């Protein structure tokens, strides 16, 4: 019943009837800035209920890249569409030019007083594995973490000068805590069966044996993920590429098992 603009970056736009389970509209913006060259990319569609207003800015050599997504639920609300002074200073880098990995970190000032310093780790087994800069993201005030058989996610978000500075986090520099949780991914009969679920050694602040059930992929394909998580993960959730996310957490080795 909701209707959204649906625009490809090429500027071909049309109205889109949202499917069931998509009851927000989104506008997504990418600015690619380099010396005296700007490229602006804009994309629009119907999107899932869980989306929020968010931004991320990071410098990567002589390049600056800025992402923003704005979402609303009223009806062709995305059909329309600041930038003055400098507020919180943050460390910035990014894995697309090896800048993070190589320690070539730079400083960036945020543009709204709402933005914070971000550090995000996305280890998958086309997103950058490491991003540092300015913005606001779901799970922000603070930090959150998850790891399992093929994944390490970490997000740190803070409001003091250059608080995202330091060496980049990698899973291997976090100690095994002694907690063990089951790991799996897929669905209850394919991927997450007692036959396919196994015990992994939890690391650093991740000591919750976690289970998220929801949907993934084009349609509402059902999906499920088990592993080791921070307390903070057990309270949105874009970190597992899922939608109607349902999280249980327990804090005993093995408790995570398909019961």
């Amino acid at each position, epitope marked *: 019943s909701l209707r959204c603009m649906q625009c490809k970056t090429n500027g071909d736009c049309r109205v889109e009837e949202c499917a069931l389970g998509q009851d927000l509209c989104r506008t997504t913006i990418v600015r690619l800035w380099e010396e005296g060259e700007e490229l602006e990319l804009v994309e629009k569609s119907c999107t899932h209920s869980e989306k929020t207003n968010r931004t991320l800015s990071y410098r990567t050599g002589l390049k600056i890249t800025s992402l923003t997504e704005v979402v609303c639920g009223l009806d062709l609300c995305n059909q329309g569409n600041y930038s003055r002074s400098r507020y919180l200073e943050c460390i910035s880098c990014g894995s697309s030019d090896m800048s993070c990995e190589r320690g070539r970190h730079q400083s960036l000032q945020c543009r709204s007083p709402e933005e914070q310093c971000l550090d995000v780790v996305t280890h998958w087994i086309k997103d950058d594995r490491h991003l540092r800069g300015c913005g606001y993201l779901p799970g922000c005030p603070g930090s959150n973490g998850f790891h399992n058989n093929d994944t390490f996610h970490f997000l740190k978000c803070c409001n003091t000068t250059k608080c995202n500075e330091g060496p980049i986090l990698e899973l*291997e*520099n*976090l*100690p*095994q*805590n*002694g*907690r063990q949780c089951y790991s799996c991914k897929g669905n209850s009969t394919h991927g997450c069966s007692s036959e396919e679920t196994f015990l992994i*050694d939890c690391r*650093g602040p991740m*000591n919750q044996c976690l289970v998220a059930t929801g949907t993934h992929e084009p349609k509402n394909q059902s999906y499920m993920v088990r592993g080791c998580a921070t*307390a903070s993960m057990c309270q949105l959730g874009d970190a597992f590429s899922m939608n109607h996310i349902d999280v249980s957490c327990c*804090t*005993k*080795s093995g408790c995570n098992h398909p019961d």
Partner: antibody
Framework: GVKLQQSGPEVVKPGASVKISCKAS????????IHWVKQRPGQGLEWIGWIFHGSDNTEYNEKFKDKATLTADTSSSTAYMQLSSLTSEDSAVYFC???????????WGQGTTVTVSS | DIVLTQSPDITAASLGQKVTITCSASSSVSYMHWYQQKSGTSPKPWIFEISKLASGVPARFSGSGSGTSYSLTISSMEAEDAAIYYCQQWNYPFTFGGGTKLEIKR
């Protein structure tokens, strides 16, 4: 500011139980692992276990699973360790220690002496 | 389950002598830390993450190693360095080596 205050020396009978305390100040208690460590007289250091956030989130040394129980009281930022069914082999100094930001035992309490005797 | 052997158990060192404590791990541990203890008082963090000095640790102290072998060096032995030193794996079993008692030779 940042410290771990342990409860006083204990004299207890064999077969009895003892519970000892570790009051944390000057930082956010529930964001950090508290570990417990045993040292018998003239001997080394044994890891007993940890607690994170509260009583439902613990890990033990297999050697102490039937001996130690770790609890926490968030309202007062205090960790506890109960030792049950005492013998003379449990006569030791017991330390609590924070697991710090760069993952070593960074702050220690002073120790509590447990003498088991009649 | 990772055994840590500390060698030697006891050494007496002259003032000015280079001292080396080694810690041996039956299997590979990414980070090893070192604690100093006097008079069965609280162990003091001394060297963390292999080679980093704790606040107030003097520059004559260093640490190094990897995998199954780590060392603590004191490049020139002083009287206040007499103590028991314990290595510890950074991770889960948090096992401590059995300790090296460092004394003054005379």
């Amino acid at each position: 500011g940042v410290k771990l205050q342990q409860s006083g020396p204990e004299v207890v009978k064999p077969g009895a139980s003892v519970k000892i305390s570790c009051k944390a100040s000057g930082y956010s208690f529930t964001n950090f692992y508290i570990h417990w460590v045993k040292q018998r007289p003239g001997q080394g250091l044994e890891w007993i276990g940890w607690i994170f956030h509260g009583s439902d989130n613990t890990e033990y040394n297999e050697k102490f699973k039937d001996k130690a129980t770790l609890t926490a009281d968030t309202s007062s930022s205090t960790a506890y360790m109960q030792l049950s069914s005492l013998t003379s082999e449990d006569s030791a100094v017991y330390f609590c220690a924070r697991w710090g930001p760069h993952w070593y035992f960074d702050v220690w309490g002073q120790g509590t002496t447990v003498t088991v005797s009649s | 389950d990772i055994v840590l052997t500390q060698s030697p158990d006891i050494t007496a060192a002259s003032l000015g002598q280079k001292v080396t404590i080694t810690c041996s791990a039956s299997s590979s541990v990414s980070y090893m830390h070192w604690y100093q203890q006097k008079s069965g008082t609280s162990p003091k963090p001394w060297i963390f993450e292999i080679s980093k000095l704790a606040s107030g640790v003097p520059a004559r102290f260093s640490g190094s190693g990897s995998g199954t072998s780590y060392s603590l060096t004191i490049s020139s032995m002083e009287a206040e360095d007499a103590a028991i030193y314990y290595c510890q794996q950074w991770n889960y079993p948090f096992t401590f080596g059995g300790g090296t008692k460092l004394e003054i030779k005379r």
